[PDB]
Amino acid sequence: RPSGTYAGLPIADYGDAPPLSTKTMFWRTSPEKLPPGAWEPAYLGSKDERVDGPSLQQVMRDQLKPYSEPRGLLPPQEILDAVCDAIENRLENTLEPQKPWTFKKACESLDKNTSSGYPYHKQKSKDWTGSAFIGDLGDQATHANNMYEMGKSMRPIYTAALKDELVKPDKIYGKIKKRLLWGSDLGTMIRAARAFGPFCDALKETCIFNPIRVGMSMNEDGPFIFARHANFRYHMDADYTRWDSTQQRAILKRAGDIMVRLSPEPDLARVVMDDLLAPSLLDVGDYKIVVEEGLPSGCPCTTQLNSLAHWILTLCAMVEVTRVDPDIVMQESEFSFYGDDEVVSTNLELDMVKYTMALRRYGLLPTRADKEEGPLERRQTLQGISFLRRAIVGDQFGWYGRLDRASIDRQLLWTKGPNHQNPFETLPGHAQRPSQLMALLGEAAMHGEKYYRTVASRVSKEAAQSGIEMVVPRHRSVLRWVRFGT
Amino acid sequence: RPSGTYAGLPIADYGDAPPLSTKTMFWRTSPEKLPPGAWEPAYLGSKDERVDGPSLQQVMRDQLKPYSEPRGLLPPQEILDAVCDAIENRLENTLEPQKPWTFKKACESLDKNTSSGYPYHKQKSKDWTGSAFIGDLGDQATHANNMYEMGKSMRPIYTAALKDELVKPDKIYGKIKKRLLWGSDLGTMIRAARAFGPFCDALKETCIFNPIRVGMSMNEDGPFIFARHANFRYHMDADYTRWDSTQQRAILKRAGDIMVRLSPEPDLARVVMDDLLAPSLLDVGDYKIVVEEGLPSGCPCTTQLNSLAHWILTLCAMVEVTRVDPDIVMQESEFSFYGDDEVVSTNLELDMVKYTMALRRYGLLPTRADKEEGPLERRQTLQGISFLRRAIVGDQFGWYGRLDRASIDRQLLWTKGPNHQNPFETLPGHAQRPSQLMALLGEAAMHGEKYYRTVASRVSKEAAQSGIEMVVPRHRSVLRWVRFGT
Ligand SMILES: O=c1[nH]cc(F)c(=O)[nH]1
Ligand SMILES: O=c1[nH]cc(F)c(=O)[nH]1
Ligand SMILES: [Mg+2]
Numbered sequence: 001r002p003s004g005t006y007a008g009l010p011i012a013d014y015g016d017a018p019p020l021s022t023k024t025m026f027w028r029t030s031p032e033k034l035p036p037g038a039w040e041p042a043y044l045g046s047k048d049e050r051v052d053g054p055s056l057q058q059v060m061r062d063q064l065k066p067y068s069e070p071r072g073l074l075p076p077q078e079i080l081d082a083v084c085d086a087i088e089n090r091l092e093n094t095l096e097p098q099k100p101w102t103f104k105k106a107c108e109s110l111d112k113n114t115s116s117g118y119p120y121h122k123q124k125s126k127d128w129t130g131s132a133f134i135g136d137l138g139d140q141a142t143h144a145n146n147m148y149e150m151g152k153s154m155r156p157i158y159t160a161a162l163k164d165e166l167v168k169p170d171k172i173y174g175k176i177k178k179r180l181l182w183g184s185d186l187g188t189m190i191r192a193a194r195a196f197g198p199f200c201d202a203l204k205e206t207c208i209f210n211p212i213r214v215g216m217s218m219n220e221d222g223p224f225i226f227a228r229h230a231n232f233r234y235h236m237d238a239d240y241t242r243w244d245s246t247q248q249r250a251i252l253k254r255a256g257d258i259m260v261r262l263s264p265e266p267d268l269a270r271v272v273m274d275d276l277l278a279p280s281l282l283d284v285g286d287y288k289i290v291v292e293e294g295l296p297s298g299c300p301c302t303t304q305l306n307s308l309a310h311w312i313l314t315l316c317a318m319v320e321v322t323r324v325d326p327d328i329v330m331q332e333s334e335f336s337f338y339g340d341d342e343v344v345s346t347n348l349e350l351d352m353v354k355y356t357m358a359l360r361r362y363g364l365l366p367t368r369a370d371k372e373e374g375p376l377e378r379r380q381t382l383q384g385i386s387f388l389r390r391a392i393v394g395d396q397f398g399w400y401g402r403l404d405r406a407s408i409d410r411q412l413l414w415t416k417g418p419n420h421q422n423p424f425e426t427l428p429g430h431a432q433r434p435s436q437l438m439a440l441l442g443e444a445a446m447h448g449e450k451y452y453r454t455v456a457s458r459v460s461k462e463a464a465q466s467g468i469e470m471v472v473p474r475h476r477s478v479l480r481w482v483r484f485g486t
Numbered sequence: 487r488p489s490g491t492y493a494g495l496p497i498a499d500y501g502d503a504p505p506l507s508t509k510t511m512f513w514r515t516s517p518e519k520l521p522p523g524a525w526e527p528a529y530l531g532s533k534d535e536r537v538d539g540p541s542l543q544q545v546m547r548d549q550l551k552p553y554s555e556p557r558g559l560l561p562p563q564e565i566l567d568a569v570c571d572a573i574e575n576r577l578e579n580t581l582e583p584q585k586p587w588t589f590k591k592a593c594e595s596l597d598k599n600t601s602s603g604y605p606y607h608k609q610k611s612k613d614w615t616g617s618a619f620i621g622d623l624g625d626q627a628t629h630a631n632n633m634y635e636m637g638k639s640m641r642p643i644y645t646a647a648l649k650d651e652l653v654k655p656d657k658i659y660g661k662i663k664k665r666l667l668w669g670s671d672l673g674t675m676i677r678a679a680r681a682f683g684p685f686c687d688a689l690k691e692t693c694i695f696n697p698i699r700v701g702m703s704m705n706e707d708g709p710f711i712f713a714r715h716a717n718f719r720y721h722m723d724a725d726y727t728r729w730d731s732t733q734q735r736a737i738l739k740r741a742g743d744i745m746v747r748l749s750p751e752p753d754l755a756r757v758v759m760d761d762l763l764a765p766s767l768l769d770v771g772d773y774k775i776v777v778e779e780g781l782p783s784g785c786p787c788t789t790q791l792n793s794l795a796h797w798i799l800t801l802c803a804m805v806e807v808t809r810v811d812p813d814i815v816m817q818e819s820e821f822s823f824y825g826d827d828e829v830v831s832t833n834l835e836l837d838m839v840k841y842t843m844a845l846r847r848y849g850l851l852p853t854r855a856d857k858e859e860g861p862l863e864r865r866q867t868l869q870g871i872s873f874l875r876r877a878i879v880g881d882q883f884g885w886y887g888r889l890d891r892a893s894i895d896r897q898l899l900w901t902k903g904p905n906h907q908n909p910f911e912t913l914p915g916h917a918q919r920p921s922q923l924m925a926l927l928g929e930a931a932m933h934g935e936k937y938y939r940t941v942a943s944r945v946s947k948e949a950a951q952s953g954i955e956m957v958v959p960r961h962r963s964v965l966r967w968v969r970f971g972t
């Protein structure tokens with residue numbers, strides 16, 4: 001056995017995980033000195049020549065703390081039942097009944113350029129023929145499919161990791177922070193995909209009529225989604241600190257319950273869900289620790305499981321404060337969820353102080369989207385609310401999501417390439433970067449003439465020192481392309 | 487020459503048109519007695535055994551009166567310039583620039599199961615190979631294309647006709663009324679199609695962002711269109727009596743001006759438009775009369791020319807009453823036009839008495855959508871406004887267009903077939919009618935359980951006495967199909 005405490009959590013066995021990556025995927029696009037207080041790749045550990053800091057492993061201990069924190073309270077049982085049944089019912093009425101996912105289709109759906117997790121820690125492509133897994137992964141997949149078809153429980157193993165992403169300089173040179181990732185094992189992946197693939201697809205095709213926006217296109221779908229939010233009087237942001245680690249399994253189980261009953265094979269899906277939500281085994285390297293609470297984020301369905309819990313919690317707080325039936329608040333409101341990310345629009349007169357408190361009571365840590373210091377605030381125009389890193393703007397033509405210039409400028413300073421030790425290194429000219437460049441041009445168009453021109457230059461210099469030179473379109477032409485599509 | 491008065495209008499030459507059709511396309515679906523005061527095919531003339539009435543030709547004289555009526559006043563010149571430039575400008579900003587239509591593409595686009603008009607009065611298919619006109623129509627088309635390519639004027643000839651459609655019983659057994667149709671000549675058709683096809687397609691792809699809804703799908707597009715209308719505070723119907731005959735050519739010319747400047751071949755399009763709006767030659771049979779005013783409705787672009795004039799008139803009245811810039815009222819409002827059919831939604835505080843008057847002054851005859859006795863009224867919910875024979879309903883899921891039951895029941899009493907003299911005759915079982923039947927089932931779904939079931943029966947009896955028997959779906963399944971699509 002072991003057991004055994006690590007990072008505040010019970011040790012369940014010895015670890016098998018590779019060492020945490022000590023490298024970043026991001027290369028500077030230009031050799032010149034970086035704009036002051038500009039974002040950089042997150043901390044890379046001891047071998048990181050930018051600052052001396054703790055080991056990556058100590059950074060991860062830090063990320064594990066909240067998972068041993070005392071859970072918040074459950075919402076009132078009567079309210080929780082009402083909102084669950086309402087959500088479920090709305091889903092019965094909107095989801096197109098789907099036919100069961102095959103083994104072939106589950107394997108196909110998986111991202112082939114990411115790790116297989118426990119036990120082989122292979123990249124998924126290495127054992128993939130184009131249509132089936134063979135070799136080692138062939139074994140893991142096949143065994144899992146057998147367990148799935150025979151409704152037999154199998155215990156999932158997650159591999160912990162630290163997200164390589166651009167962060168504010170503070171999180172590098174001030175108090176060092178780096179976000180925790182859970183990596184599902186391939187077995188669990190295929191098992192969850194077969195079970196819940198059909199439900200997730202059903203949900204994804206309902207991305208505009210139902211509040212879970214997973215699978216949406218900001219450009220094509222945003223204007224209709226935002227127009228719906230604008231039918232209602234009051235609008236609010238809410239951001240959440242540490243969403244994943246503050247979740248209650250009890251609530252996750254209710255989200256899971258809804259997912260089961262709406263799956264085309266409920267008896268087989270129940271075994272899968274029970275395993276997913278059973279106390280979780282997480283491989284930190286030296287050990288596999290037990291993480292009883294919070295969200296286990298490794299799998300294909302996770303982002304929708306997470307959004308569904310979010311839907312439940314928002315309604316519970318709303319119902320609790322307003323005292324209107326969950327079904328009726330859903331006719332007086334429009335919601336958008338994507339993991340921790342919410343926009344609530346309503347006609348109900350919601351007490352924003354009592355709303356914040358009711359959420360805080362559930363164990364959540366709400367903050368405003370770009371404002372700081374709560375309670376949460378409501379506004380009487382959608383104009384300026386934020387969702388998915390975009391500002392919601394609205395004009396003569398309609399609503400849209402606009403990426404702020406700080407973000408555009410940022411994507412022009414850094415490019416994605418092979419893993420390497422020094423962030424500041426330049427590679428050669430990225431002729432894999434004409435697709436990205438068009439989108440960015442498009443993103444800048446929405447900021448008007450003067451800004452567009454200034455990124456048009458930056459884009460052209462880069463298109464020169466590259467194997468493909470570009471027709472840089474006129475402002476009005478690209479604006480028209482971005483806003484009006486298709 | 488001639489000249490010569492007929493129906494209050496100058497006679498320009500002798501007619502060449504076939505006699506007015508004395509038959510209807512509508513067959514009863516059932517032999518049994520018709521529900522009291524139910525709609526029937528419009529009057530068929532002397533040979534019509536339902537009632538004794540005037541000849542079809544006297545019915546048409548009646549329809550020609552308003553075209554010799556004194557025109558209403560033009561809107562204030564300054565306002566007309568402002569709104570034209572605004573509309574044009576909005577179109578510059580939204581329309582995707584198009585490439586010129588070829589001869590092949592113009593010929594392709596034309597409806598092949600309708601008459602070629604002057605001079606051959608042939609059905610268009612009779613001289614069509616699948617890719618080109620040959621024979622007589624080959625000559626007419628080719629000559630017209632030459633005139634078009636050489637920017638040479640050619641004078642259009644319209645053939646008058648009377649619409650075969652279902653009407654309220656009053657228009658048969660009370661005061662006899664039958665609607666006038668203008669049939670373009672094939673030459674003019676191809677000339678207008680080459681010239682204005684590109685503009686019409688550009689416009690059609692902008693059907694949600696721009697107020698001209700030609701080409702929209704009620705089912706797919708309605709919910710987004712209606713959600714936009716719902717962003718605004720006040721909503722209104724307006725129906726118009728005799729829209730086409732009360733139009734001013736001067737205003738039609740401004741709509742035409744906008745269409746020209748946004749066409750990819752403006753110099754060639756100008757010749758076409760000038761001909762279209764020049765005093766019109768209309769063949770009533772015995773004579774070709776001159777109709778100086780009103781809308782000439784024969785052609786491919788007509789419905790958009792008509793909607794564009796409508797856009798101009800609405801804004802002119804709105805600007806005139808509110809005194810806000812046309813561009814600004816377009817940021818405080820959402821419009822829908824389809825020929826004579828309008829929904830105006832606004833946040834502006836519009837004086838509905840002064841609005842009605844300003845319209846009446848332009849020569850228009852506004853009435854409420856289903857209310858009678860003006861001024862026009864505004865409502866503070868879109869809920870219940872009508873557009874394109876549909877009621878706009880809105881619920882938990884969103885907005886939609888619902889066809890009223892009187893209309894559904896109606897489509898179940900009558901079916902389309904070959905022309906014949908007695909409306910009341912039944913044909914056999916229509917196994918060309920399973921597509922129509924599904925849609926109707928779908929239309930009825932939106933009226934809830936009890937109604938749906940009652941048309942489910944009516945539909946099944948009919949599907950029995952037919953060469954294809956049908957799986958009649960459960961209510962919730964079809965409702966879900968109708969509302970949520972695709
Ligand atoms: O609200 C959020 N926005 C973006 C994120 F990456 C996240 O975790 N939460
Ligand atoms: O507003 C209208 N609705 C339907 C019609 F046929 C018409 O001409 N006008
Ligand atoms: Mg957040």
Ligand SMILES: [Mg+2]
Binds near residue numbers: 725726727826
């Ligand atoms: Mg009308």
Ligand SMILES: [Mn+3]
Binds near residue numbers: 204205206214
């Ligand atoms: Mn989608």
Ligand SMILES: [Mn+3]
Binds near residue numbers: 204205206208209
């Ligand atoms: Mn969708």
Ligand SMILES: [Mn+3]
Binds near residue numbers: 690694702
């Ligand atoms: Mn369209």
Ligand SMILES: [Mn+3]
Binds near residue numbers: 690692694
């Ligand atoms: Mn459109």
